[PDB]
């Protein structure tokens, strides 16, 4: 009640001052409020009284725009600043040439925020309830923010104050400034260190993506230049050879017999995505990921030394919700897990529905059209509908995850963030990469020979695939998803502000910054999640098509600048924090890398359909099995596809049939044989080769990872020398 | 020169006093010396003067046994003790009820040793040369040791002094005290913490070995009880079935044709080492190792909290050799690596010589004898000679490694220990486990069909193996090595002191302890190396025979007590130290675990020869390939071994031949066939099954490891609660 703040002066002499009306001591916080009402007024004035008693100096100012709105500028004197600084163990190199300039405005703001969090506002309805965020949540205080130095475009009137926001906007946040490299020290002195560590991680990710993209484009060009040398690609649509295959129909009843001529362009496109360049790139990408994790860890250690990110934290006071609400924890966790598993099963049901749509639309496309084969059109439309359903599904699930976390009881904000991280990442991973996995792994592997096809449900046969393999379809879907997401997010975040800029053609500092959207409690969580999803796309299915990094890299570039812009001209300044590396995203990324090594190996082995070519070239073209005198790939397409005398185990093919011998895509004995349709020796040879390749690839890659981790020092020699020098100086 | 120590009193009033002649302040060090000679006398008296000036109180005592020998008792007053303690950051819970009893004699001894290391002895021939170990190395000071409380058997005359050495000898070091459990707190308060952490690690290793041994004996009993149910074991020596195989000869010229009757007992013994119990035990051992590493890490964290092993260290002053001697480092490291690779290649040459001996001795044994087959006798004798050659080779190599490390320049003692660790472990690993690997993996896998056998060198064929497989031979060699090493070391360290004890049927304390061998600079290095080698034996080839842990466990038990005895009644007391966990042995053990998972998988797949049995049972006994109506193993031995019409690609078999059709051990087509001797479809089926098993086993085991590491907390809840309680108490 007593010890009220000085009455509002509302002089508004200068639009930007960064000082009190006296112009002597800087502003360190702005608490804005508008004035049932009487009781909350008592509470807020009690809070002001307690804050002034602690030592903070406050003064009000009536808003020129709104009479009811009143700002309160909060400044910390030097003594309380030093006391709470040594309380918080915030360390310095000393140079006290200016006490105001000795402590950075970011440091002053975070110290004042710590004080505001650690003070009480005299309520006994609950035993010792306290905090600053409590007031904002209650709505008694409209906002509690720090203030920016100046307008991004316009330099500050004061000459003593460096226009940090202007400098950043004109040096690393301008959308037409891409040549420039990130001033990480500037973005760390300002905006705290968590934002700085995020941008440093993004820059490192960009550099490694650039390297990977260069190598991937090299591999893609190698594949493209040799597309004339590919033999079976020429054979598949050579009218004498490929025009007489008369392959058995994929569906059950309505699909007619079809020849291999109709896949010429698809085969030609495939021959550049499954060449040995793809294998080389997959091996290189495994090595690149295993190196990138370690090198990022080394960079993180260097940053930690440079930015002392291991500064001792406080007790991390609980969230307002958790304290307000407080083996029930066990049952609550069980309910949350049940909900997340329910949504995962919903995603799987969406995938199954996509499969059913794929079958039905292929049946329709077979009749409608007499360029693009019905197979490729079906794949494209299924991928497009999968992309849009993924968009809507994740838009719903982010809301449902925010809801389910509230059903959970997060003890602290960090725990809330970790739980939300785990749930959101798990859902996004399952969604995207299951949609890709079904095509990559379980597409047509388990379909039996056409005499006795397998029925997963009883009505629909499990769909087969073209003789080339499913690799082209996986590449098509992956490109569709990547391009759709990148184009959507990029076009939004770029063009919409860009368009609004063309639409365009006094006020004090505090209210000027007040008209800005707060960054949000989560902060950079969503950007981290999106970047991790893109990283998984780049690494898990790189062998699907080598141009995966480059596209990401392009988007990634813009992303950096976009965030910078979105963090400078759109959001009111936030209190600085301290982040170790990134949080749970580092273990998530390590797990993604470990999974992606085996995923690339299995993509090359089971999906790429390259191992059969090598096996036929090295063993099934010699007088032991082939008439050719020397190793050669020619005749692969005729000696690989099986035979089928048309006696269905009924006879769905008879209605649309024309002849006797159809040739499906599998390695089984010809009909006239002691083992009529059992697996051929070639099939077991191919399976053994594929499994041996997986074994060799996994073991070689893991050995290289272990050797690189053991050999490359975890901390740079320069950093160790700097540590030794500063320790020596501090010792004396 | 001046400030000399008080002249020797040599009162020798009590054989054990642990105090000066006054009986007021305890002894903390004993420096014994005997008195060219004049100059070193000046140097040592200068050192004494400097030490007395620092604050230490010294007094001499002429040895009663030898006039020339003179001891010097060194005690630290309380003030210098506290100053150097706070210098060393050695932390306490305080209870100062007795200043002498406030600091443990171990702590006092280590503090005094730190002071003695950090003092100068006034030599300007080199710029500021200093230390205590320098004097001992020079020989001016005969010894620099702390002293034990009392005789191990006889209690101390003083009642105020707890007879720590007597208590330990009579409670945990008596060879007839095995029931007792290790008093780790006593062995840590005494003997420092590095010794304590070693014994704690050994005890944990023993407990986990006991669990693994119980499970292994259970699996072995399961295999033994079902040896009557094994079918192919009965078939191989059923005279109607196995007596007519007429298998082709293993060697080139002199070996005759032999039948399968001659392997009946070998097959019966094998049928209990390759049963499904072996597979279950291999999976369990992978899980057990992956759990044991994490649980040991948790125990290590608990110990670190309990024993504050993370106490800040000093600068770790350099070794006397390195400072005395000082891109040359690069070339020196290259020379050291060249020498170690030379010795590794010498080990490989020893293995090759063992192979050649095996071939020659098999040729000899074939003629000599008409129980034990020549195969088993050859395996036994080769294993015995391999064991003895390994013994002599490692005895030589330890000396050569000590030499080569001196050729290297170790900056500090820790670096010297790490380099010696790496070299010694690498050599021992290569030696033992290469001798085992050749039998386990490359024994008879690469030998071609007898028509065109492979010649590795041109003279000798690569030896084949019995139809059962090489598993029995691997078990024989592994048991020979394990038993030989365990029996040798155990019988030595136990019986020799035990025999010397039966041979048996005044003096002051300092000279009483003086007649003891110093523990040696390396300390517990050799015991760590031996334990790690035994751990590798237990884990790498566990599937070879399930009784591997139990035997080790037995030896392991005695080892503990032996060390305790060897550390109490044989070695003069050493200064306490501080060890984090074990040193480089922890990464070595983790690497051994990671390797051993895949090693066990490959032992089960490639060596055990179980996958062929499962494949034949599940696929090659059905009308598709076998006449049997239902799944059955019978007829495996006849339908698996190939056929060979005797037309050698010469004809070495003709001289001793008797008939036409021999049947070797491989899966190739019969002679009358379009592919006469190429690999049969059964062979590719078996290879695919083996590779699929390896894939599944590795991935399941690694997934279980990852899940266990993520799920099981790294620090126990009790330890976290204790940390919180002590932090709360310290905060107030």
Curated annotation (Swiss-Prot), chains A, B:
Q: What happens when the gene is disrupted?
A: Mice are viable and fertile, and display no major morphological defects. They exhibit deficiencies in Ca(2+)-dependent phospholipid scramblase activity in platelets and defects in blood coagulation. They also show reduced skeleton size and skeletal deformities.
Q: What is the effect of changing residue 563 to R?
A: Expected to disrupt calcium binding. Loss of scramblase activity
Reported effect of changing residue 391 to K?
A: Induces a constitutive phospholipid scramblase activity
Recorded protein name is Anoctamin-6
Segments passing through the bilayer: 201-221, 276-296, 337-357, 380-400, 422-442, 472-491, 525-545, 546-566, 584-604, 693-713
Q: What does this protein do?
A: Small-conductance calcium-activated nonselective cation (SCAN) channel which acts as a regulator of phospholipid scrambling in platelets, osteoblasts and fetal thymocytes. Phospholipid scrambling results in surface exposure of phosphatidylserine which in platelets is essential to trigger the clotting system whereas in osteoblasts is essential for the deposition of hydroxyapatite during bone mineralization. Has calcium-dependent phospholipid scramblase activity; scrambles phosphatidylserine, phosphatidylcholine and galactosylceramide.
Give, from the UniProt record, the effect of changing residue 390 to K/E: Induces a constitutive phospholipid scramblase activity
Disulphide bridges: 230-271, 237-264, 248-662, 251-255, 465-470
Q: Which amino acid positions bind Ca(2+), per UniProt? A: 493, 527, 530
| Activity regulation text | Exhibits synergistic gating by Ca(2+) and voltage. Inhibited by some non-specific cation channel blockers such as: ruthenium red, 2-aminoethyl diphenylborinate (2APB), gadolinium and cadmium ions.
Report the record's Gene Ontology biological process terms.
bleb assembly; blood coagulation; bone mineralization involved in bone maturation; calcium activated galactosylceramide scrambling; calcium activated phosphatidylcholine scrambling; calcium activated phosphatidylserine scrambling; calcium activated phospholipid scrambling; calcium ion transmembrane transport
Membrane-topology annotation of the record? Multi-pass membrane protein
Topology: which residues are Extracellular? 222-275, 358-379, 443-471, 605-692
* Residue ranges, Cytoplasmic side: 1-200, 297-336, 401-421, 492-524, 567-583
Report further notes: The term 'anoctamin' was coined because these channels are anion selective and are predicted to have eight (OCT) transmembrane segments. There is some dissatisfaction in the field with the Ano nomenclature because it is not certain that all the members of this family are anion channels or have the 8-transmembrane topology.
Q: Spell out the reaction equation it catalyses.
A: a 1,2-diacyl-sn-glycero-3-phospho-L-serine(in) = a 1,2-diacyl-sn-glycero-3-phospho-L-serine(out); a beta-D-galactosyl-(1<->1')-N-acylsphing-4-enine(out) = a beta-D-galactosyl-(1<->1')-N-acylsphing-4-enine(in); a 1,2-diacyl-sn-glycero-3-phosphocholine(in) = a 1,2-diacyl-sn-glycero-3-phosphocholine(out)
Q: In which tissues is it expressed?
A: Predominant expression seen in epithelial tissues. Also found in skeletal system where it is primarily expressed in osteoblasts.
Family statement drawn from the similarity comment of this UniProt entry: Belongs to the anoctamin family.
Annotated effect of mutating residue 269 to A: No effect on lipid scramblase activity
| Consequence the record notes for mutating residue 493 to Q | Expected to disrupt calcium binding. Loss of scramblase and ion channel activity
What results from changing residue 527 to Q? Requires much higher calcium levels for the activation of scramblase and ion channel activity
Q: What is the effect of changing residue 480 to K?
A: Induces a constitutive phospholipid scramblase activity
Q: Which InterPro entries match?
A: Anoct_dimer, Anoctamin, Anoctamin_TM
What keywords tag this UniProt record? Answer: Calcium, Cell membrane, Chloride, Chloride channel, Disulfide bond, Glycoprotein, Ion channel, Ion transport, Lipid transport, Membrane, Metal-binding, Transmembrane, Transmembrane helix, Transport, Voltage-gated channel
Look up what happens after changing residue 395 to K: Induces a constitutive phospholipid scramblase activity
What species was this sequence derived from? Mus musculus (Mouse)
């Amino acid at each position: 009640q007593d010890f009220r703040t000085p009455e509002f002066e509302e002089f508004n002499g200068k639009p930007d001052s960064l000082f009190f009306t006296d112009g002597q001591r800087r502003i360190d916080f702005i608490l804005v409020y508008e004035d049932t009402n009487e009781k909350q007024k008592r509470k807020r004035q009690a809070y002001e009284s307690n804050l002034i008693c602690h030592g903070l100096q406050l003064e009000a100012t009536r808003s020129v725009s709104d009479d009811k709105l009143v700002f309160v500028k909060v400044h910390a004197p030097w003594e309380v600043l030093c006391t709470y600084a040594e309380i918080m163990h915030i360390k310095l190199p000393f140079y006290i040439l200016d006490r105001d300039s000795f402590f950075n405005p970011a440091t002053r703001s975070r110290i004042v925020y710590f004080i505001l969090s650690r003070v009480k506002y005299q309520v006994m309805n609950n035993v010792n309830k306290f905090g600053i965020n409590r007031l904002v949540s209650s709505g008694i205080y409209k906002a509690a923010f720090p203030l920016h130095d100046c307008r991004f475009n316009y330099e500050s009137e004061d000459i003593s104050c460096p226009s940090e926001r202007y400098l950043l906007y004109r040096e690393w946040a301008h959308p037409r400034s891409i040549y420039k490299k990130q001033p990480l020290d500037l973005i760390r002195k300002y905006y705290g260190e968590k934002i700085g560590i995020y941008f440093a991680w993004l820059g490192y990710y960009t550099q490694m993506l650039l390297l990977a993209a260069v190598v991937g484009v090299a591999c893609f060009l190698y594949g493209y230049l040799d597309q004339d040398n590919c033999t079976w690609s020429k054979e598949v649509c050579d009218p004498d050879i490929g025009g007489q295959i008369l392959m058995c129909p994929q569906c059950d009843r309505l699909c007619p017999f079809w020849r291999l001529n109709i896949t010429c362009e698809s085969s030609k496109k495939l021959c550049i995505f499954d060449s040995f360049g793809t294998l080389i790139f997959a091996v290189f990408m495994g090595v690149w990921v295993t190196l990138f994790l370690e090198f990022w860890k080394r960079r993180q250690a260097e940053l930690e030394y440079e930015w002392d990110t291991v500064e001792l934290q406080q007790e991390e006071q609980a969230r307002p919700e958790y304290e307000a609400q407080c083996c029930g924890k066990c049952i609550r966790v069980t309910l949350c897990a049940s909900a997340v598993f329910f949504w995962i099963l919903l995603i799987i049901a969406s995938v199954i529905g996509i499969i059913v749509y794929r079958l039905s639309v292929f049946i329709v496309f077979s009749t409608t059209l007499p360029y693009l084969t019905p197979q490729m059109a079906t794949s494209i439309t299924a991928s497009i509908i999968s992309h849009i359903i993924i968009m809507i599904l994740n838009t719903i699930y982010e809301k449902v995850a925010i809801m389910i976390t509230n059903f959970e009881l997060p003890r602290t904000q960090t725990d809330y963030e970790n739980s939300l991280t785990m749930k959101m990442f798990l859902f996004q991973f399952v969604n995207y990469y299951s949609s890709c996995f079904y095509i990559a792994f379980f597409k047509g592997k388990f379909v039996g020979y056409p005499g006795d096809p397998v029925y997963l449900l009883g009505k629909y046969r499990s769909e087969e695939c073209d003789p080339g393999g499913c690799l082209l379809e996986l590449t098509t879907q992956l490109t569709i998803i990547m391009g759709g997401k990148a184009i959507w997010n990029n076009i939004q975040e770029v063009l919409l502000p860009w368009v609004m800029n063309l639409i365009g053609r006094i006020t004090p500092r505090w209210e000027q910054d007040y008209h800005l959207q707060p960054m949000g409690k989560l902060g950079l969580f969503y950007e981290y999640l999106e970047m991790i999803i893109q990283f998984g796309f780049v690494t898990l299915f790189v062998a699907s098509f080598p141009l995966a990094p480059l596209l990401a890299l392009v988007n990634n570039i813009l992303e950096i600048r976009v965030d910078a812009w979105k963090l400078t001209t759109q959001f009111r300044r936030m209190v600085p924090e301290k982040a170790q590396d990134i949080g749970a995203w580092q273990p998530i990324m390590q797990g993604i890398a470990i999974l992606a090594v085996v995923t690339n190996a299995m993509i090359i082995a089971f999906t790429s359909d390259m191992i059969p070519r090598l096996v036929y070239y090295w063993s099934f073209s010699i007088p032991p099995y082939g008439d050719h005198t020397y190793y050669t790939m020619d005749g692969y397409i005729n000696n690989t596809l099986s035979v089928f005398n048309i006696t269905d185990f009924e006879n769905p093919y008879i209605g649309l049939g024309n002849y006797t011998l159809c040739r499906y895509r599998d390695f089984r004995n010809p009909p006239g044989h002691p083992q009529e349709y059992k697996h051929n020796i070639y099939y077991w040879h191919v399976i053994a080769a594929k499994l041996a390749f997986i074994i060799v690839m996994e073991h070689i890659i893991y050995s290289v990872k272990f050797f690189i981790s053991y050999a490359i020092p975890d901390v740079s020699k320069i950093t160790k020398s700097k540590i030794k020098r500063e320790k020596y100086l501090t010792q004396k």
